[PDB]
Amino acid sequence: EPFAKLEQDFGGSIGVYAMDTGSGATVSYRAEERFPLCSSFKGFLAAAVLARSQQQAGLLDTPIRYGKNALVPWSPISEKYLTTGMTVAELSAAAVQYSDNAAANLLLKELGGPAGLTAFMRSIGDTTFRLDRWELELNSAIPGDARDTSSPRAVTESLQKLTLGSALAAPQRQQFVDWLKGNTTGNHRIRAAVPADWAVGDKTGTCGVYGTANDYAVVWPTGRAPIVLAVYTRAPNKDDKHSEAVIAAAARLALEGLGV
């Protein structure tokens, strides 16, 4: 009942999946529905890059040069190195931690485009994820369009595989975790619901239309096993605005449903 009231007050749909990786206890609400990924695909993009470094030594230190044409609106890191260039690892951290759009499109090119990232997700067992377009077009968030979508459950399952399971090798796994821990864009979303002395890494998404915004996180409580969760929103009207407070509140309800 609380998620229904929350999404009704929000004016749209909230999708939540949360897993206690110790007990296997789960919180689930609209967890099979598709929601636009928006910038949240960039976490999985970095994970895919990391998986490639497991077969190309010094891929992460490989420098990537680019010109004014590579710049996309909201490229707050990459634009300061336009006259200089950046490394693959630098691009990935920018994509994860600042949601940098030019960095995301550059790494997408190295992976063979949206279908190449989708291929990486299929390789870890994710049959739901799909990326179809690049920045910025992938943010259109059109109702009922499956392009550039996943489900809360598939996001949480893939996040668990990549940060806590064996989809990545341990060095790359800890690098992925460390990138997510350093994110700067999520202080008012899942992090705002997480007890202050718990470790947390997340990746946000905000499409800018149709009330569509999201966050997924891995959380390390002290003295219990980690929690993985995803909170996605959308709304029926193009001019509906997203709400960070709604995402924080849904996260709070999820954590309380797992006994936090």
Ligand X SMILES: O=C(N[C@@H]1C[C@H](c2nnn[nH]2)c2ccccc21)c1cccc(F)c1
DSSP alpha helices (H): ranges in the chain? 2-10, 41-53, 88-98, 101-110, 113-123, 152-163, 170-181, 190-193, 244-257
Does 74 belong to an annotated binding site?
Answer: yes
Nearest to 70 by CA among 52, 85, 53: 85
Give yes or no: 137 in active site: yes
Residue with tokens 């002290």: 222
Nearest to 229 by CA among 214, 248, 251: 251
Of 25-33, 53-61, 171-179, 200-208, the window that binds ligand X (rule: CB under 6 A) is: 200-208
Q: How many residues does the chain have?
A: 260
Cβ-count burial of 249 within 10 angstroms (0-12 exposed, 13-18 middle, 19+ buried)? buried
Nearer to ligand X, 39 or 175 (CB): 39
The catalytic residue among 23, 32, 123, 137 is 137
Q: How far apart are CA 155 and CA 44, in angstroms?
A: 9
Binding mask 28-47 for ligand X (x = CB under 6 A): -----------x--------
Give yes or no: 39 in active site: yes
Of 53-61, 170-178, 201-209, 245-253, the window that binds ligand X (rule: CB under 6 A) is: 201-209
Q: How far apart are CA 216 and CA 11, in angstroms?
A: 21
205 is a contact residue toward ligand X (CB under 6 A):
yes
Nearer to ligand X, 59 or 136 (CB): 136
Binding mask 88-107 for ligand X (x = CB under 6 A): -----------x--------
Residue list, annotated binding site for a beta-lactam: 39, 42, 74, 99, 101, 204, 206
Contacts to ligand X by CB under 6 A? 39, 73-74, 99, 185, 204-206, 208
Residues annotated as catalytic (active site), given as ranges: 39, 137
